[PDB]
Amino acid sequence: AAYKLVLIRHGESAWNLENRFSGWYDADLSPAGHEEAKRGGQALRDAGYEFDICFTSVQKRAIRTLWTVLDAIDQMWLPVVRTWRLNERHYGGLTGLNKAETAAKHGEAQVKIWRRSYDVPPPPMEPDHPFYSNISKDRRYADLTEDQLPSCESLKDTIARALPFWNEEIVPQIKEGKRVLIAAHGNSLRGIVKHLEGLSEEAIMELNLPTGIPIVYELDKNLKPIKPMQFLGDEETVRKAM
Amino acid sequence: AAYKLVLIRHGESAWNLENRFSGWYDADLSPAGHEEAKRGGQALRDAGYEFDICFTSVQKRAIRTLWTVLDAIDQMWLPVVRTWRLNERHYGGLTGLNKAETAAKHGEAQVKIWRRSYDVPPPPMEPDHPFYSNISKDRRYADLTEDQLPSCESLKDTIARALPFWNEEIVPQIKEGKRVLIAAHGNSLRGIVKHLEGLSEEAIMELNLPTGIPIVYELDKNLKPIKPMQFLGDEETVRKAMEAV
Ligand SMILES: [Cl-]
C-alpha cells in the first residue's frame, strides 16, 4: 500500500561451504552465493522494483550481493551507504573454526547456545586468535571507539549496534518516501526484522531469513508491517522458503 | 609526496566500439573496457595503494570501472559517492549518432568544433531525439533544477558543473588526509586536471587522458601537483600511454 522496504541476505560464502564460523571475517561469496544474488536481482528486475538508496555492511559477501542486485535491476547509479553496524554478528573466538569440529569438542548443547541463544555471546576473540589482527586491526574499523570494536557479539549485541544505524540513517529515508534496499547478513537483518515485527527474543531466535531472496516489507506511515513479509522469486524458490 | 590523488578514466564502452557518441547515455563497459579496469585495479593492487573514499559519476561505465578496481584492490568496503556532476560531457543531439557518419553528414570541420572546441556546445537534444526520455527523463536526474539538467554541453559547460563538486565535496576530503580515488569520464576528469594543473583552455583541449590507467597526482599543502601525472602498470602499458603526451 504505502512504504515498501526490501531486505536481502547474502547467499553462500566461501567459508559457508568450508563449514566455518565467519562472523566479521570478510569471507567472499562462493560461486553459488553469487549466483543466488544474481537470481534475486532478476526477481526484483522482473517485479520492476525501483529503489532510491541502498544500505549494506562493510563486508564483501553483502556488498557484492548488493552490487549484483543493482546490476541486475539496472540501478548501479543508486547511492549506497556502507556501515559496520550492518555487519554480520561477530563470532569471537569461534571465528574461523569448523562448525562440525567445534560441536565435537564442545558438544551440541554448547554450540546451540553459542549460535541460537539471544544474549549469550560466544567466547571473546583473544589477541592470539588466528584472525585477531585480520579483523580487529583492519583499517576498515579504525574509527570505532575502543568500546565499539567488539571482540564478540551475541545476537542481542549485534541488534544493539544495528538499530542505532537503522534509526538515524535508514528510518529517516523511509519516512521521506525513499524506497530502501538493505543488503546485509543473517543476524544484522534479524535485528531489523525483530524491530519491525516486534518479535520476542524467543521468536527472533527461531527465525531464519532465506538467502539471496528479496524480502519485501510493506510498512504503514509508522514503519509498521501492514502485512507479513513476502519473498520475490519463482514459485518453487519463493514457496520453498516458507 | 604529501597528499595522494588517484584518477581513473573508464575504458571502452559498448558504444565506444559501436563508434557512437555516448555523452549522458548510460552505455556499459565493453568486455575489453572491463578488462582495462581489471588491469588498472591490478596495478593499484601491486603498487599497494589504499583509499579512504571514492567518487564516481552516475554512469555505468564509470561505476563499473570503480567496482572492478575496488574489487581488485580488496577495498569494496570503501564508501563511494556518486554524482551526475562527474558525468561525461552531455553530447546533446549528437548523442547516439555514429561519429563517422556525423563527420560525413556535417563535415570534418563542423564536427571537430563540436568534438574539440572549448566553448561551442553541440546541437541541443530535442524532445523528439531517440534518447530524449532515456536521458533527460531518467529518474536519476530528478533532483536537478530545470537549469541544471543540460540538453547539451561544451567542454566548458562540463567543467563548469564538475568543479563545484570537486571544490565543495572532494577537496575537503583530500585536505583531511583522506586518500581519494575518482573513477569518472574523459571530460569530467579533464575538468579536475585543468583545475589542478591550471592548464589553459587550448591546453586541456589537447590533453587526452589514458583510459583504464591509474593517474597518480602528488599534491602539496595546497592541492598543487608537485610533479607531472604518473601512470600505473607494466612498462608496455604505461610507456604506450606515456608516449601520448
Ligand atoms: Cl557502490
Side-chain angles (χ1 to χ4, degrees), chain A residues 1-3 5-41 43-104 106-111 113-115 117-162 164-201 203-205 207-234 236-238 240-242, chain B residues 1-38 40-104 106-107 109-111 113-145 147-201 203-205 207-220 222-229 231-234 236-238 241-244:
Chain A
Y3 304 155
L5 201 204
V6 178
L7 305 176
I8 186 168
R9 172 177 186 176
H10 67 71
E12 172 178 291
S13 81
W15 272 23
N16 266 308
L17 68 184
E18 272 181 56
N19 193 205
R20 302 215 268 161
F21 289 113
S22 309
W24 275 30
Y25 176 65
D26 204 22
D28 205 328
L29 287 177
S30 71
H34 188 303
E35 205 54 48
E36 261 185 285
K38 204 170 173 184
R39 283 195 293 297
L44 283 163
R45 194 269 309 297
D46 298 335
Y49 271 71
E50 306 193 319
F51 300 102
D52 303 306
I53 187 172
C54 304
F55 296 95
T56 192
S57 70
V58 291
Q59 294 182 284
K60 284 184 178 189
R61 63 187 122 130
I63 300 181
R64 171 158 282 128
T65 292
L66 203 219
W67 284 5
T68 295
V69 169
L70 292 178
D71 189 1
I73 70 181
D74 193 7
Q75 277 163 271
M76 295 188 245
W77 58 268
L78 284 178
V80 343
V81 172
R82 303 168 165 68
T83 178
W84 65 277
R85 287 176 180 285
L86 283 176
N87 263 26
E88 174 60 278
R89 156 238 214 155
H90 189 131
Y91 249 100
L94 296 175
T95 305
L97 302 179
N98 174 284
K99 298 180 185 182
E101 313 188 321
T102 302
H106 305 278
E108 294 308 324
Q110 190 57 65
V111 174
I113 293 284
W114 288 332
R115 321 210 315 168
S117 92
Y118 186 77
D119 45 30
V120 179
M125 180 168 70
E126 304 290 45
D128 65 312
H129 186 290
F131 295 88
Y132 182 73
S133 305
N134 177 270
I135 307 291
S136 66
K137 289 306 135 209
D138 193 305
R139 202 211 327 173
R140 184 178 329 202
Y141 311 110
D143 302 321
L144 303 221
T145 72
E146 270 191 65
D147 307 299
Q148 304 185 309
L149 197 297
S151 63
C152 56
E153 295 184 306
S154 61
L155 166 53
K156 178 193 183 188
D157 285 318
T158 303
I159 290 181
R161 45 73 156 169
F165 186 83
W166 160 272
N167 291 321
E168 305 161 13
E169 310 303 304
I170 306 177
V171 171
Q173 295 299 315
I174 302 179
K175 280 178 176 174
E176 213 182 295
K178 302 296 179 52
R179 298 99 97 206
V180 178
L181 168 51
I182 304 177
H185 315 268
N187 298 310
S188 49
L189 283 178
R190 269 181 170 178
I192 281 67
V193 174
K194 180 175 179 296
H195 181 72
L196 288 175
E197 296 188 17
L199 305 179
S200 68
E201 310 185 320
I204 206 54
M205 267 193 262
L207 173 63
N208 265 78
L209 301 173
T211 56
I213 303 173
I215 299 179
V216 188
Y217 270 100
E218 279 180 51
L219 316 180
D220 58 42
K221 293 305 175 195
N222 302 308
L223 296 238
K224 291 164 179 180
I226 79 178
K227 93 184 63 186
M229 65 171 81
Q230 315 176 306
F231 314 84
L232 304 190
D234 52 33
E236 36 173 51
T237 309
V238 50
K240 178 185 181 181
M242 308 189 126
Chain B
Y3 292 144
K4 277 264 188 183
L5 204 203
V6 179
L7 305 177
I8 187 168
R9 171 178 184 175
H10 66 72
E12 172 177 290
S13 81
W15 272 23
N16 267 310
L17 67 183
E18 271 180 57
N19 192 205
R20 302 216 268 161
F21 289 114
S22 307
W24 276 29
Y25 176 66
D26 202 24
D28 206 328
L29 287 177
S30 73
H34 189 303
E35 205 55 49
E36 260 184 286
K38 202 170 175 182
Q42 230 126 50
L44 283 164
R45 195 270 309 297
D46 297 338
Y49 272 71
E50 305 193 319
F51 299 102
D52 304 306
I53 187 172
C54 303
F55 297 93
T56 191
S57 70
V58 291
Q59 294 182 284
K60 282 185 179 188
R61 62 186 122 131
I63 299 182
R64 173 159 280 126
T65 292
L66 203 218
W67 284 5
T68 295
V69 169
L70 292 179
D71 190 1
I73 70 182
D74 192 9
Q75 277 164 271
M76 294 187 245
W77 56 269
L78 283 178
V80 340
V81 172
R82 305 168 163 67
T83 177
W84 65 275
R85 289 176 178 284
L86 283 176
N87 261 27
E88 174 61 276
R89 157 238 212 156
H90 189 132
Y91 249 101
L94 297 175
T95 304
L97 302 180
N98 174 285
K99 297 181 187 181
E101 312 187 320
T102 301
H106 296 267
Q110 183 55 62
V111 149
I113 293 182
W114 294 332
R115 297 223 300 157
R116 281 160 289 176
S117 90
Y118 186 77
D119 45 30
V120 180
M125 180 167 72
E126 304 291 45
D128 64 312
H129 186 290
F131 296 89
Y132 182 73
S133 306
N134 176 270
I135 306 291
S136 67
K137 303 304 195 177
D138 194 303
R139 202 211 328 172
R140 183 178 330 201
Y141 310 110
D143 300 322
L144 292 194
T145 72
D147 310 298
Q148 304 184 308
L149 196 297
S151 62
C152 57
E153 294 185 306
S154 61
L155 185 49
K156 186 185 160 183
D157 295 314
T158 316
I159 296 181
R161 49 75 164 176
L163 276 298
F165 184 85
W166 159 268
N167 298 304
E168 296 183 292
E169 311 300 306
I170 306 177
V171 172
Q173 296 298 315
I174 301 181
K175 280 178 177 173
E176 300 166 55
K178 302 296 179 53
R179 298 100 96 205
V180 178
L181 169 53
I182 303 176
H185 314 269
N187 299 310
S188 49
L189 284 177
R190 268 181 172 177
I192 281 69
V193 174
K194 180 174 179 296
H195 181 71
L196 288 175
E197 296 185 18
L199 304 179
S200 68
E201 310 184 320
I204 199 184
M205 285 192 256
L207 172 63
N208 265 78
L209 302 172
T211 56
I213 304 172
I215 300 181
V216 189
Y217 269 98
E218 279 180 51
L219 317 180
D220 59 39
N222 295 295
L223 303 206
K224 169 171 188 167
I226 79 168
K227 27 153 63 176
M229 63 172 81
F231 301 148
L232 292 187
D234 47 59
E236 70 174 71
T237 298
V238 42
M242 251 290 92
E243 289 179 47

